[PDB]
């Protein structure tokens, strides 16, 4: 509260470390559904159904331009990529499986790096 602060957790490396994680996600073999924004002209249903599209390229641009205020807003966008994928894709499809795999991969790197 006012003039009463918990000890300062060092956040000075968060930007670099989120960039590293994102590089690892970008280079994973199962990243291909997620690298670029879904083409809303070419994929029926996507525009109306997925209220907040997100993709790795869009997160990389946001990261690079100071549009994440802290590491939690970065994690929220990453998880949005996978939550969107689950909303639109059956579990038993290549893309549906890709998304489960990538989410698992991310969440381990996240825990190992920060928790």
Curated annotation (Swiss-Prot):
Residue ranges occupied by any Bromo domain in the UniProt entry: 9-113
Domain of life: Eukaryota
Tissues of expression: Expressed at varying levels in several tissues, whereas a smaller transcript was expressed specifically in testis.
Subcellular location: Nucleus
Family: Belongs to the WAL family.
Summary of subunit composition and partner proteins: Component of the BRF-1 ISWI chromatin remodeling complex, at least composed of SMARCA1 and BAZ2B, which regulates the spacing of histone octamers on the DNA template to facilitate access to DNA. Within the BRF-1 ISWI chromatin remodeling complex interacts with SMARCA1; the interaction is direct. Component of the BRF-5 ISWI chromatin remodeling complex, at least composed of SMARCA5/SNF2H and BAZ2B, which regulates the spacing of histone octamers on the DNA template to facilitate access to DNA.
Function: Regulatory subunit of the ATP-dependent BRF-1 and BRF-5 ISWI chromatin remodeling complexes, which form ordered nucleosome arrays on chromatin and facilitate access to DNA during DNA-templated processes such as DNA replication, transcription, and repair. Both complexes regulate the spacing of nucleosomes along the chromatin and have the ability to slide mononucleosomes to the center of a DNA template. The BRF-1 ISWI chromatin remodeling complex has a lower ATP hydrolysis rate than the BRF-5 ISWI chromatin remodeling complex.
Name assigned to this protein: Bromodomain adjacent to zinc finger domain protein 2B
Organism this protein belongs to: Homo sapiens
